[PDB]
């Protein structure tokens, strides 16, 4: 009952009509995990974009489907994948963005190992997006190399936006059990508020992930993986021989329990070490179609 | 995988009405006090599928050494009380949590606030003025549940479904 109540309000809050009007050629590419990613042909270009569509009845938490149009509309940003529209299509939200041919950094992290300087590169575009979210109050939750992705030419931007949350002067920490298992951070698992620091902690852990190939525990099952990040002090690289101050450094400041402590997006941008960021072309040696 | 849960607290406090709220999206139109009833939900999390086995006990007295039977095993407690009735939220501190201590102290258990559509209730705010007394609050509650100590306070109403998945929601959290 509550759907139509529901497929009404985002009826308000989309583009009007349907873009199968001026696109062809809708093929999968992916899966996120609230729903499809295709592609598809601009008909009077040819030029390429993305869609995702998203069942409204296939939701563990159908409101969140708000942010995926607030969220592209308003928070525009260079490290940010464009938006261009959204729709209703019957059942389905209907996003249509711009095509990141590079892919994402999962591909790259599980295959190969970066240097500091490709890294660097990555979370500085990061931050710079997460700097201007939290600067609005807004918490992504989601971060993990998956939810990074690559054009043609090495840029690097932050999406997947449908688990952010709003916080502000009058709510100013969130409760939501929300995210990936082994990328959140300790006090969200311990089901204490929390506020725009829960981001900084999943993205020491995707350092980890670009250093040594995979999140902390990632071979347990995940809900022993929440207790033992719970329960257990910030891991540590495994290999710290090879790893320069300036990057452990700068990592002993996402990975820090305790969130008052813990570096902001803001103090990150002015850290020694994202001075080592390679140009957009220093990464794609790195993409699939050149290895 | 199963879940054993097992519910808690003061006679009235609803107990019965709570679970059935919930498993059948139905109210109880009559009162019944419960000895003992064993409902088995099933819920998928992650796309793995889990039996739900709700122990519903007796908030009496008189069954104090016939309901701890239903104990062994355990995975989580919800501990509850009316947030309007200071006797049952008394008794959390005084009957029910010492009970499932002993019996299972590695066990979790959570702070549960129910029937709270009747805070602003005049009727049910006018019967407690009667005995000068007043609703509980979350801020009191909560301070509580960190202090006995419990994974978190919930708050409920079994009538407007407010809150009401959330609680077990967080349970599975706390069993899981």
Request: glycine fraction near 6%; charged fraction near 25%.
């Amino acid at each position: 009952v509550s759907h139509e109540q529901f497929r009404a309000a985002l009826q308000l809050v989309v583009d009007p009509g349907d873009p199968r009007s001026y696109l062809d050629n809708f093929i999968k590419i992916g899966e996120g995990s609230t729903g499809i990613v295709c592609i598809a042909t601009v008909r009077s270009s040819g030029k390429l974009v993305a869609v995702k569509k998203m069942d409204l009845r296939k939701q563990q938490r159908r409101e969140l489907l708000f942010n995926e149009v607030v969220i592209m509309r308003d928070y525009q940003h260079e490290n940010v994948v464009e938006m261009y529209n959204s729709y209703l299509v019957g059942d389905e939200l209907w996003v249509v963005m711009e095509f990141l041919e590079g892919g994402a950094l999962t591909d790259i992290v599980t295959h190969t190992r970066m240097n500091e300087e490709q890294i660097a590169a990555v979370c500085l575009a990061v931050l710079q997006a997460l700097s201007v979210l939290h600067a609005q109050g807004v918490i992504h939750r989601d971060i993990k190399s998956d939810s990074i992705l690559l054009t043609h030419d090495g840029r690097v931007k932050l999406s997947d936006f449908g688990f952010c949350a709003q916080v502000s002067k009058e709510v100013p920490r969130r409760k939501s059990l929300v995210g990936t298992p082994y990328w959140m951070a300790p006090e969200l698992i311990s089901r204490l508020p929390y506020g725009p620091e829960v981001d900084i902690w999943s993205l020491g852990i995707m350092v980890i992930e670009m250093v040594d190939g995979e999140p902390p525990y990632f071979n347990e099952p995940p809900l022993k993986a929440m207790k033992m990040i719970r329960d257990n002090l910030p891991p540590r690289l495994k290999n710290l021989h090879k790893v320069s101050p300036s990057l452990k450094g700068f990592l002993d400041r996402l990975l820090v329990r305790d969130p008052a402590q813990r570096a902001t997006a803001a103090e990150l941008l002015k850290h020694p070490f994202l001075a080592k960021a390679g140009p957009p072309a220093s990464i794609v040696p790195l993409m699939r179609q050149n290895r | 995988q199963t879940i054993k849960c097992v519910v808690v607290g003061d006679g009235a406090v609803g107990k019965t009405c709570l679970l059935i709220s919930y498993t059948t999206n139905k109210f109880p139109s009559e009162y019944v006090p419960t000895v003992f009833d064993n409902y088995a939900v099933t819920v998928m999390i992650g796309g793995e599928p889990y039996t739900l086995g709700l122990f519903d006990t007796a908030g009496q007295e008189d069954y104090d050494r016939l309901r701890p039977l239903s104990y062994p095993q355990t995975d989580v407690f919800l501990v509850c009380f009316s947030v309007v009735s200071p006797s049952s939220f008394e008794n959390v501190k005084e009957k029910w949590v010492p009970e499932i201590t002993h019996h299972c102290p590695k066990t979790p258990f959570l702070l549960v606030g129910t029937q709270i559509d009747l805070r602003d209730d005049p009727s049910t705010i006018e019967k407690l003025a009667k005995n000068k007394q007043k609703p509980i609050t979350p801020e009191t509650a909560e301070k509580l549940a960190r202090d006995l100590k419990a994974v978190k306070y919930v708050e409920c109403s079994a009538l407007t479904q407010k809150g009401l998945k959330n609680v077990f929601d967080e349970a599975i959290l706390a069993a899981l």
